[PDB]
Amino acid sequence: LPNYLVTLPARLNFPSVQKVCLDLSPGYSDVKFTVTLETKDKTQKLLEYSGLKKRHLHCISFLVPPPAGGTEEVATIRVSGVGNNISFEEKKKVLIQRQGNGTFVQTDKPLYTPGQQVYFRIVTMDSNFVPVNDKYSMVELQDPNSNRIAQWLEVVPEQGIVDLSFQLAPEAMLGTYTVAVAEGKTFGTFSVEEYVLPKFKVEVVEPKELSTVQESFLVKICCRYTYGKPMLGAVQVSVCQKANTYWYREVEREQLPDKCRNLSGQTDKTGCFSAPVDMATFDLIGYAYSHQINIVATVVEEGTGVEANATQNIYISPQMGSMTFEDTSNFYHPNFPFSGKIRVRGHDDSFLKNHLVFLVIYGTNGTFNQTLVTDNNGLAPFTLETSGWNGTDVSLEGKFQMEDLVYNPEQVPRYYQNAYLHLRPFYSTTRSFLGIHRLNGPLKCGQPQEVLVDYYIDPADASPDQEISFSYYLIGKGSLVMEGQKHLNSKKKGLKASFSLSLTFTSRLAPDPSLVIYAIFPSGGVVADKIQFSVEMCFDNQVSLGFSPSQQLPGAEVELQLQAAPGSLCALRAVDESVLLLRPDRELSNRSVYGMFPFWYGHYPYQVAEYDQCPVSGTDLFSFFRDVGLKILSNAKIKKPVDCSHSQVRQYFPETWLWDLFPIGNSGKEAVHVTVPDAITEWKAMSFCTSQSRGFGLSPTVGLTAFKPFFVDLTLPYSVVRGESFRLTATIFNYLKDCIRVQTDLAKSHEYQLESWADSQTSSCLCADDAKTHHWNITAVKLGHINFTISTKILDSNEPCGGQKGFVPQKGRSDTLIKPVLVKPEGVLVEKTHSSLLCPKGKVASESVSLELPVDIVPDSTKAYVTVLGDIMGTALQNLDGLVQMPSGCGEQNMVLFAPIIYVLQYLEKAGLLTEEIRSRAVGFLEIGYQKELMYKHSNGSYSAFGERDGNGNTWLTAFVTKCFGQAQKFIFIDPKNIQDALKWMAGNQLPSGCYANVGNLLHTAMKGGVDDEVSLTAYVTAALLEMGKDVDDPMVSQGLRCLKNSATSTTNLYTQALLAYIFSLAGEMDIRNILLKQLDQQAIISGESIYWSQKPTPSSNASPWSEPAAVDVELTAYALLAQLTKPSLTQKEIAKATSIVAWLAKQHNAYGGFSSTQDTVVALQALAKYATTAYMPSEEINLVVKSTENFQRTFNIQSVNRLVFQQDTLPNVPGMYTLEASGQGCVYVQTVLRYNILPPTNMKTFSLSVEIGKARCEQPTSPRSLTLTIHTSYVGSRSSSNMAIVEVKMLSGFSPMEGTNQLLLQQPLVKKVEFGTDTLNIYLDELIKNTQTYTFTISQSVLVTNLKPATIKVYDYYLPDEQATIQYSDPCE
Ligand SMILES: *[C@@H]1O[C@H](CO)[C@@H](O[C@@H]2O[C@H](CO)[C@@H](O[C@@H]3O[C@H](CO)[C@@H](O)[C@H](O)[C@@H]3O)[C@H](O)[C@H]2NC(C)=O)[C@H](O)[C@H]1NC(C)=O
Ligand SMILES: *[C@@H]1O[C@H](CO)[C@@H](O[C@@H]2O[C@H](CO)[C@@H](O[C@@H]3O[C@H](CO)[C@@H](O)[C@H](O)[C@@H]3O)[C@H](O)[C@H]2NC(C)=O)[C@H](O)[C@H]1NC(C)=O
Ligand SMILES: *[C@@H]1O[C@H](CO)[C@@H](O[C@@H]2O[C@H](CO)[C@@H](O[C@@H]3O[C@H](CO)[C@@H](O)[C@H](O)[C@@H]3O)[C@H](O)[C@H]2NC(C)=O)[C@H](O)[C@H]1NC(C)=O
Ligand SMILES: *[C@@H]1O[C@H](CO)[C@@H](O[C@@H]2O[C@H](CO)[C@@H](O[C@@H]3O[C@H](CO)[C@@H](O)[C@H](O)[C@@H]3O)[C@H](O)[C@H]2NC(C)=O)[C@H](O)[C@H]1NC(C)=O
Ligand SMILES: *[C@@H]1O[C@H](CO)[C@@H](O)[C@H](O)[C@H]1NC(C)=O
Ligand SMILES: *[C@@H]1O[C@H](CO)[C@@H](O)[C@H](O)[C@H]1NC(C)=O
C-alpha cells in the first residue's frame, strides 16, 4: 500500500509563520488529500494536494491563526484523503500560543556613587529577535525605599531603542534601585554606595580552588597601589580552618578550635610575600572541620603605618577529573557501526591530551573492553560493531581507570566523574542503515556546512532498480526551517555509498538545531537518525566595534570604527574594564539575549502531549518528532506498538567613558574620533544596534588600552593658611621594561616660596617597576587658588642609566600635572549686606550706602560688589542652590533648597517670564531636593528631622513637606504614595477637637516662630493644607478650623496673631481676619516708610543699614505680608501697605537671596513671590546711576528682557560712600555686599565655648600625629533651651578626623548626625541646655604642614545666627 506522512510543529506561535509538510509514497493518482486546521472560530484548509506517480514531498507555509483564549488555544489538525473507493480521516491536537516578548534593560554601569548621572536603555524584542517599536505606557524609577522618584509617560522608541537618563542627588539614598517598564512587569536593578576609597589593594594571586591531594600550597599575597606600583610593608597572614558548625546539641560539648597556620613576612620589590602552607596542619578529611580554608592577610605600610586587609575563602574539592559523551545519541542501529567520541578533562577542565581512557561495554552477550587515547582537543573517538549485540540494550561507561579506588571510609574520597550512556535500539522492520556524520566544535553561523550521510540499502526491502527517495528535515527552536529530498538511483552508486548535504546555519536556527533524515520502504518500514548541532549564538545584524589604534596615550585622539547594517541605529557603551569585571552579571551578551526566551523547549506541550492510553485497571520514528517539537500524522510503520503492563575586591568604578547613540549610514560603516581619557586603565567597549531590516545585533567586547609610559602622583594638602609651610610630595613611576632618565621640574612661580632653591635640579635614573620620590618645602605666600605645575619628562641622556643608555620612547615624553591648592586667609570671613528697593515712579529715587571698615582687618580679604536686578526675587533666582550658606543636612534644612524654588516658578509662570532654559534648570533642582528629603521619610509615611535616627515622625515637618510636594506636582513628578502616606499618618494624629498633637514637638520656639500651646501647630497644619489647594470642606481643614475659632478669641502672642491672620485669609472668614489684622496694626513698628513687626523690644530708632536679620522678625513680617496678599481683590491702599512691608523684608537679604536660616528664608521668599506675582509690571527702561568719591561711576540698564539677569560688578575703589540714583519707570532691586576677614572675637554672650587638647607625642617626628580634641559647650542665653545646634569644627591645615570619628560621637549625648566636610566637621546636637556638654574625638595628620595657624571652633543656634560663640585652638607642640 502507498504511504503518506503529514508533519507540522506541535507549538504554533501567533506572530510566527509555520510550515506543514506532506510526504507521499507513490500510488495516489486517484486519491486527493486535504489537511485542515480546525479551531473554535474557523476551519482553515491548510494543504490541499493530490498524489503523483512518484514520491514527492510537498510542503506549504501558512500564517498561524489567532488563539481564541487570547493567550493560548488547543486546535485540531485534521488530515482527510478522499478517492474513488478510499475514504479515511485522522485528527491530532496542536497548541497555538502567543509569542513572548523579551525586554531587556541595560544600565551604563551596575554600581554608581551618588551624584553620578545614570544612563540606561530599554528595547523590547520578540523571539525572532526583531525590535518592537510600540509605545510604553509607563517607565518609572524606584529608590531603595521604593518611592517613585521619576517617571516618563508614553515613551516612543527610536528604532526600538529608548534612551533615558537620570541625575542622582549628591547624597542620594543608598542601596538598590529599580527601573520599571510597562506597569512593573519587566524590570532591572542597580546599586548605589560610596566608594573609590582604597589607596592600595591587597591581592591574593595564587589562591584558587584546592584539592586534598596537595601536600602544601603557596599562598601568594601581592600588595600594589591603585595606580599599580608596588608597596613596601610588613605582611601578616592568618590561614585557618574553622570547626564545622553542627546542628546537634549535647551537654558539655564545645566547638573545636580553629586549626590555623599564621605566617608573617615582608614584600619584595614586586610587592609580594609568598610562603608554602603544609596541608598536614588542617584536617583534610574529618566532618568535624569545614571544607574551606580562610586566609586573612593584613599589611601595614613601611613608614606610614597605613594598614589594609584582605580575605579570600578557598573551598577544597576532591574531584580530579571529568568525562562526558559528546557527538552521541541515546539510540543505535543494529548490525551497523555506532561511532562516537569521549571528551576527557582534568580537575581544571583542561583537555587531557594522549590520555589513556577505558571504554567499558555492558551487554547481554558479555562485558567487553576497549582502550582509547585522546587527541589535542581532549577527544577520544571510538567505533563499535553492533553486529554481535543481537539487537539488545547496551549500557556504555567511560572510565579513567579500570580497578576501583581503595580509600579509608572515614576519609573524604577523590573520585573520577565517569560518563554513562544508555542505548535503546531503533526498531526497524527493514535491514537497511542511515547514519549521519556530526560536525566538530560550536559551528560558525552563516557559513555553509557540508554534512556527510552514510547509507546502506538491503535488497530485501527495495528492488535494486527502484529509485530511493530520502526525505530530510531541519528543525530550529521547535519550528520547521528547511526541508528537501535527495533522490538516489540504485544503479549509479550501487547498494553501498554516501551523499552530502549543503547546510547553512542562520540565527533562526537554534543554538541547538535538529536534523532528522528518514526514508520509507514499500514494506512500510522506516529507518531514521537524529543529530543535534552546536551553533554560535548569532544575529542577522552584523555589528562590529573597533578602535584605531587599539593602544593610545591618555589625552590623545583615537578613531572608533563602528559597523552594522545600513539604516541601523547603534547604542555604544564604553566602560572601565573594572566595571565589567566586578559584576559579570547579565551584562548584554549573546547568551543573555537568547537567555530571555525559552528556546530549550523542544518537546510536546502538556496540553497536546500525546500519551499512550493503557487500560490500567486496579525509541522509534514517533519519538524523534516528539523530541523536536513536531507533531506527526502517518500510516506507515512509524511507532512501536504500545506494551502496557506497568562580586570581588578587584578595582574601582570610574567614569563610563562613552554612551551615545549612533546611526549607521548607507555605507554600513561609521568612524568618529574620541579623546582618550587621562586615567591609565584598559577600557572595554561594546555596541548593540537595531535595524527594522535586519533585527537586533550585538558586537564583540573590544578593548582600548590607555597606556602612558610613566605616571606621576601629587600628594598635596587641600587647604593651607598663609605663612605655613607644607610638604608637596611628588612620586614618579616607571611602567616600562627599560631604565629611563627622568628629570622632574617644579615650575617656578612668584606665588609661593621654595626652601629647596637651587638644590631641586638633578636627573635621577629610574629602572623597571621602580619609583623615585620628590619632595618640596613650600612656604605659602599668595592667597587664593595657586596652581602647582610639575613637568616631569624623559631626557635623551647618555649617562649610565641602568648599565646601558637611558631609554627614550617615541611617544609620551613629557607628563605635566597641575593641581591647585587653596591658601585661605587667617580668621573668619565676615559679610555685610545693605539691600535696597528703589522704585523710580518717573522721578529720580536715591539712597546712600557708606562702606565703613573696622580696624583689625586681616590683609587682602577686602572685596565688595553691587548686585542689580529688575526683579525683587532675582537675587534668589541666581542662587536657588545657595540660598543660605549653612549645612542643610536635616529633614527641614534640606527644604531650604526645595520650597523657594516652587514659589519662584509659580511667580514666573503667572507672570509669564518662565523660559524653557529657566524651567529646565529649576526642574532639575527640585529633583535633587526630592531625593534628599526622602531619606527623612519614615516607614509610616511621616517625616522627621533626621529620618529613622529619630524614633518617630514630626507633626510640623510632615505638614511642611506635604505642603511642598503637592505644589511640586505642577512642575516635576512626585509619587502620590508619599503624599497619601503623609496624609494617612497625619489624619491619625488629628486630635478630637480638630487640633493636631505635636508628635516630635512643634519644633523650636524660634524655628516654629512660636510656642504657647498645641493650637500653634493647629494653625500651621491647616495653613499648609489650604496652600496645597485643599477644600474648606476637607475633614482635616474643617475640624482644624473648628479648633481655631474659640482660641482666636483670647490670643495674645504676636506671632500667633500673624499666623492666624494668614489662615483665615485662606479660609475666607474675613470677619476674623480683620479682627486679627487690626491687632497687628496696633503692634506694627514703622521705621521710615518701612512697616514690620517684632517680638523683640523696640530699638531706639536707628536701624543699621547693614543686615542684622532677626530670624524671629523676618519670618514674622512675611506672615503678615502673606495675610495681606490673600484678599482676592486689592485696593491701592492695601497694595501700598504691602509695599511698605516690602521695603523692610527686601532690606534684610544676604548676598544670595536668602536671610538667616531655614523657615525665614522660605517664608519670606514665599511672601515676596506672592507680592511680585501681584505687583508685576513689565519695566520699560530703568537707568541706574552709581557714584563714588575717587572718580568711579557705573550705569546699568534694566528692560523687560533682562529683568531676571544677574548683573554684578565689583568696586575697584576702596571702601567709601556710594549713592544710588534710580531713574525711569519700574522697580529695580539693588544690593550692596561687603566682605572682610577679622580675627574671631571670643564672644560668650549666648553660648559658652572652650576646647581642651589631648596629649600628642610631640617628641615623635616619624609618627602620623594624632590630636585628641575635647570640646565643652553650654547655652547661657536668655531662654531655657536653645534650638538645634551646630558645632562647626574647622580643621587644622593637614589634619583630618580619624576612622570611627562618626561612630564615636553618635553614641555620645544629644548627637543626631555627624558630618565630615572638606576642611570643616559639622556636628548636629538636638538642643543645648544650660548644662555643660562635653564632646571628644581624635584627629590625625595626613599631610605635614608646619607653622600652623589657628583654626576656628564655632558653636551657634541654627535658627538664630545672632546667638553664637567663637573660639580658636592651636598646635600645642608649636
Ligand atoms: C508583544 O508585543 C506585541 C507588539 O506590540 C503585542 O501586540 C500588540 O498588542 C496591542 C494591544 O493588545 C495591539 O493593539 C490593539 O489593536 C486592536 C486591533 O487588533 C485594537 O482593537 C486595540 O484597541 C489595540 O489598540 C496590537 O495590534 C498588537 N500588535 C500586533 C502586531 O499584533 C503583544 O501583545 C505582546 N505580547 C505580549 C505577550 O506581551
Ligand atoms: C578590614 O578592615 C576594615 C576597616 O578597618 C574592618 O571594618 C571595620 O570593622 C569594625 C568592627 O566591626 C567596625 O566598627 C564597628 O562599627 C559599628 C557600627 O558600624 C559600631 O557599633 C561598633 O562599636 C564598631 O565600632 C568598622 O565600622 C568597620 N569599618 C569599615 C570601614 O567598614 C573590617 O572588619 C576588616 N575585616 C577583616 C576581615 O579584618
Ligand atoms: C558570543 O559572542 C562571542 C563574541 O563576543 C563569541 O566569541 C567567539 O569565541 C570563539 C571561541 O573562542 C572564537 O572562535 C574562533 O574563531 C576563529 C576565526 O577567527 C577560528 O579559527 C576558531 O576555530 C574559533 O572558531 C571567536 O573568535 C570569538 N569571537 C567571535 C566574534 O565570534 C562566542 O562564541 C559567542 N558565544 C556563543 C555561545 O555563540
Ligand atoms: C590653573 O590651571 C587650570 C588648568 O588645569 C586653568 O584652567 C584653564 O583656564 C583656561 C582659560 O583660558 C581654559 O581655556 C579655555 O577654557 C574655556 C572655558 O571652558 C573654553 O571655552 C576654551 O575653549 C579654552 O579651553 C582651560 O580649559 C582651563 N582648564 C581647566 C582644566 O579648567 C586655571 O585657570 C588655572 N588657574 C590659575 C589660578 O592659574
Ligand atoms: C620647611 O621650612 C620650615 C621653615 O620654618 C621648617 O620649619 C619646616 O620644618 C620645613 N619643612 C620641611 C618638610 O622641610
Ligand atoms: C509611625 O506612625 C505610627 C502611627 O500611625 C506609630 O505607631 C509608629 O510608631 C510610627 N513609626 C515610626 C517608625 O515613626
Numbering used by the authors: 20 to 637, 669 to 696, 727 to 1454
Wording from the paper:
Human alpha-2 macroglobulin-like 1 (A2ML1) is a monomeric member of the A2M superfamily (A2MF) of protease inhibitors and complement factors. The functional inhibitory unit of A2ML1 is a monomer that depends on covalent binding of the protease (mediated by A2ML1’s thioester) to achieve inhibition. A2MF protease inhibitors utilize a unique trapping mechanism that pseudo-inhibits proteases regardless of their catalytic class.
Structures of native A2ML1 were determined by X-ray crystallography and cryo-EM at resolutions of 4.4 and 3.1 Å, respectively. An initial crystallographic map was obtained by molecular replacement with a map excised from an early stage cryo-EM map with a resolution of 3.8 Å. Density modification with 70% solvent and two-fold averaging resulted in an outstanding electron density for the X-ray structure in many regions despite the resolution. Overall, the cryo-EM and X-ray structures are very similar with an overall root mean square deviation (RMSD) of 2.0 Å for the entire molecule. However, in both structures, it is evident that the strictly conserved residues Arg730-Pro734 pass through the same narrow opening that houses the Nt-α′ in complement A2MF proteins.
